[PDB]
Every structure is written in C-alpha cells, then in structure tokens.
Write a protein that binds this ligand. Structure first.
Ligand SMILES: CC(=O)N[C@@H]1[C@@H](O)[C@H](O)[C@@H](CO)O[C@H]1O
Ligand SMILES: CC(=O)N[C@@H]1[C@@H](O)[C@H](O)[C@@H](CO)O[C@H]1O
Ligand SMILES: CC(=O)N[C@@H]1[C@@H](O)[C@H](O)[C@@H](CO)O[C@H]1O
Ligand SMILES: CC(=O)N[C@@H]1[C@@H](O)[C@H](O)[C@@H](CO)O[C@H]1O
Ligand SMILES: CC(=O)N[C@@H]1[C@@H](O)[C@H](O)[C@@H](CO)O[C@H]1O
Ligand SMILES: CC(=O)N[C@@H]1[C@@H](O)[C@H](O)[C@@H](CO)O[C@H]1O
Ligand SMILES: [Ca+2]
Length: 401
C-alpha cells in the first residue's frame, strides 16, 4: 500500500486521481466536484462552526470510506461522539450524520486536539476505514464492522501515547506500510529514536522497535518548528522511506524492505534551513509528479514552486522553478492559504491547488514534472469569502473512486 496517513495530511488522496475539494465552512459542508462544471455545492448542514458548533481546537473533521464502496464519507470527531454522514453516490450525503460511537471525543474519552491524534484508516485490509486514536495510554482502535456499525474501542498498542511521552511539539506519528504486506504500520519519530510498530492485521501492533537513531529532537536537533519530516515510497516498491528537510537540505533513510532502515544521507543541498526554508513561510511536500510513481520533491518557496525529481531510487536531479507562483512573493501565507500537491487530472502525476486570497488557483503537471500556466478555478473557499484556518477546514480528497 502506497497509502500514507500523516498529521499534516490525514486525508490521503489517490494517484492517479481527479481529487475534489472539500470545505468545512461556517454553515456546513461544501464540495467542488472535479468535473466540467466547477461550482460549490452545500451537502451537509452540519460539521460547521455555526452548523453544529464545530471547533478546530476541540474537534476533528475528515473524509474516509467507512462502507467500502470507494466513496468517501464525512467523518467528525465531535463533542460527544463520532458522527458520520455517508456518501449517497450523487454529490449528496446522508444529513444529519449518525453518531456511531460515543468515544474518541472531547466529552467522551477526554480527547484533546493538543494532546492526541485521530485518523481514519483501513488497518485490516477490509476496504473500510477503522477509527484510530493516538490516545493517552497508547493507540486505540474501533473496528469498522460494516453498515456504520463500529466496535467498542480497544487498545491496539500501549505505545505512542501521551503516557509514553509523545508530544505534538516534539514528535511525529504516521501510518504507512513499512513491510510491503499492504498493512499500515506505525512510524513514530519519538524523542531519541524513530520507531516502528508492525501491524498484526487485527487491530493490534507488535511492540515498538527503534529503527533510526536520527530525525528527532534529541537525535539530530529535528524540530517541528524548523525541520519537517515525511514518510513516502522513494524507490518504487510500495514500501515507505523516511525523508526530512534538515538544515543543510534533504536527508533520507531508505527502507531495507522489511522495515529496518538504512543510514541517514544528505541526498540534496536544498529545501533546508541553509537553503532559506521556513515552516512559517513555506510548504514542503513529497508526492509523485512522474510516471516513476515515487516521491519527488515540491516546495512552495518565495519566488514560486520548486521541484526536484526522484531518479527512481532515492536520488534527485536539479531543483527547478516550475512556476512563478503559489509562493510567498505572490502573497501565499501558511496561515491563510492552504496548498496541496495532488492529482487533479487523473494522469498519475500530481498537480497543485491552493485556496488563495480571492480564488482557488490550480496549476497542472504536464505529465513529466513540469507545469503549465496557472488557472483561476473559482472564487470561493477563500479568505475573501470568509474562510480562515481558525474557523474552517479544507481538503483535497477523492469523493469518488
Ligand atoms: C461539535 C459537535 O459534536 N456538534 C454536534 C452536531 O454535529 C450534532 O448535529 C448535534 C446533535 O444533537 O450534536 C452536536 O454536539
Ligand atoms: C485520551 C484517551 O486515551 N481516551 C481513552 C478513551 O478513548 C477510552 O475509552 C478509555 C479506555 O479506558 O481510556 C480513555 O482514557
Ligand atoms: C517520545 C518517546 O521517545 N517515547 C519513547 C516510548 O515510545 C518508548 O516506549 C520508550 C522505551 O524506549 O522510550 C520512550 O522514551
Ligand atoms: C536538523 C538537521 O539538519 N540534523 C542533522 C542530523 O540529522 C544529521 O545526523 C547530521 C549529519 O551530518 O547533521 C545534522 O545537522
Ligand atoms: C526559500 C526559497 O525560496 N529558496 C530558494 C532555493 O531553494 C533555490 O534553490 C534558489 C535558486 O533559485 O532560490 C531560493 O530563493
Ligand atoms: C495569495 C494569492 O491569492 N495570490 C494571488 C496570486 O497567486 C495570483 O497570481 C494573483 C493574480 O491576480 O492574485 C493574487 O491574489
Ligand atoms: Ca495530474
């Protein structure tokens, strides 16, 4: 499994794909269906700042296939429980949503945005999303048993929890396949080590196992505030490697193939602190922009977008300015204008969309990792129309696969 789930990007998108745009705005849930007709459509009078009292700092809103039909349902970790509005198949969703489990929630379970993490993930290879919470005592799971019926939460592993020292300002946690069986394992960038927890295919993980003594805060000086880190297949074998944007530039540790990891290696003198890159100003990604289907590099910098292509094995060609936009010099701010690298045309090669000041802007990969001219898609889901990071959530996501 190519699927990777991350703090930054808890709603993975498909490659190839024609992703849609989803906004959790004040009055409810809105979608822009990737198609010949580009318009906003309100679909759920809920999951909104004013529509149900939803709060960025108390609740979590995501999209995920909870039924197994490759349609994406709206999922909200609310005040008293978990609320799902399933996809009706026709640009509409069951409304109101159904409370499926009184847990994983602020007033049910004591969940806290600033202490814990909540994802949706197909962890048993059923075609459906199980509920996954990095809680206090460890990782908790609620089995998705089909038909909106979710099993009581059980401990999957007494690690990666708040009790074992995990902290959002110090550490990073991921779901990704590090062994090749297609089952998503825990990759955690802890205090001193980077650990692994192999997925036993049953809502449990085998005990943690350190695999790299680097890429952390007490092991390399990796900070959340300066040195982003991702998990992505860089070699092409559907197993996940490690990649961090450090001081000099990009470092990596390639998967052996069984989920033990190589050695840390400055593979590129750019996208790093020395090369000018700041989390405050700039967004850095890894996604496939070519037919090699491997992690290439994309950074939204000052002048524009910067791309470095992955030869096929972990090594990277020359950095280039693929477009003079989506950058800080064109007014793109991290705290105002979400940007995403995602396939919008269905060719396997990831494109670029940003929710800007007055419009949603797109920019299409030519198919080689070079890019076209910018497109003004629509004048909605923008600052000008009322969308802030403090009161709304926005995703690119595949509603239909
Ligand atoms: C933040 C949150 O959970 N909001 C929910 C809302 O979505 C739901 O419609 C209502 C049902 O009575 O309960 C509220 O608590
Ligand atoms: C933050 C957290 O871990 N919350 C959990 C809750 O989801 C679970 O039902 C319970 C199991 O006893 O323990 C609580 O602490
Ligand atoms: C944040 C962090 O690094 N936590 C780890 C924990 O997950 C592991 O169980 C333990 C044993 O090595 O070491 C702790 O310090
Ligand atoms: C944040 C950062 O860049 N950390 C790196 C560290 O991970 C690595 O082990 C070493 C290699 O020479 O250089 C440090 O400066
Ligand atoms: C923060 C930022 O934008 N950094 C870029 C850098 O990575 C690129 O290599 C260089 C070459 O033109 O231009 C800088 O301005
Ligand atoms: C933050 C933002 O939206 N910046 C855009 C810029 O990307 C675009 O090139 C220009 C065209 O008018 O308009 C600015 O508002
Ligand atoms: Ca594309």
């Amino acid at each position: 499994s190519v699927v990777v789930i991350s703090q930054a990007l808890p709603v993975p998108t498909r490659i190839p794909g024609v992703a849609d745009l989803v906004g959790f705005g004040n009055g409810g849930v809105y979608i822009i269906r990737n198609s010949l007709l580009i318009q906003v459509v309100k679909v759920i009078n809920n999951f909104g700042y004013d529509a149900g009292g939803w709060r960025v700092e108390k609740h979590v809103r995501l999209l995920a296939d909870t039924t197994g039909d490759n349609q994406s349902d709206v999922v909200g970790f609310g005040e008293n429980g978990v609320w799902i509005s399933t996809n009706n198949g026709n640009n509409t969703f069951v409304d109101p949503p159904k409370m499926v489990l009184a847990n994983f929630a602020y007033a049910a379970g004591g969940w806290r945005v600033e202490k814990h993490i909540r994802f949706m993930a197909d962890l048993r290879k059923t075609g459906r999303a199980d509920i996954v919470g990095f809680g206090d005592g460890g990782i908790y799971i609620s089995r998705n048993n089909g038909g909106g019926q979710f099993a009581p939460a059980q401990l999957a592993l007494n690690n990666f929890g708040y009790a074992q020292g995990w902290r959002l300002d110090r550490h990073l946690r991921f779901l990704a396949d590090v062994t090749g069986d297609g089952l998503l394992d825990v990759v955690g960038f802890g205090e001193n080590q980077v650990y692994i927890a192999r997925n036993s295919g049953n809502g449990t993980f085998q005990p943690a196992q350190a695999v790299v003594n680097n890429f952390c805060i007490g092991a390399g000086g990796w900070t959340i505030s300066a040195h982003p880190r991702v998990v992505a297949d860089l070699t092409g074998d559907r197993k996940a490697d490690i990649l961090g944007f450090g001081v000099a530039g990009v470092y990596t540790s390639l998967n052996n193939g069984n989920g033990t990891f190589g050695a840390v290696n400055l593979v590129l003198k750019d996208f790093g602190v020395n090369s000018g890159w700041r989390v405050e100003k700039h967004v850095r990604c890894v996604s496939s922009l070519t037919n090699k289907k491997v992690g290439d590099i994309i950074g939204f910098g000052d002048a524009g977008v910067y791309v470095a292509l992955n030869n096929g094995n972990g090594t990277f060609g020359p950095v280039k300015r693929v477009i003079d936009n989506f950058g800080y010099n064109q007014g793109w701010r991290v705290d105002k204008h979400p940007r995403f690298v995602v396939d919008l045309t269905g060719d396997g090669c990831a494109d670029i969309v940003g929710f800007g000041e007055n419009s949603v802007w797109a920019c299409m990969n030519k198919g080689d990792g070079t890019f076209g001219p910018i497109m003004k898609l629509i004048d909605d889901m923008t600052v000008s129309k009322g969308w802030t990071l403090q009161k709304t959530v926005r995703y690119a996501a595949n509603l239909y696969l």
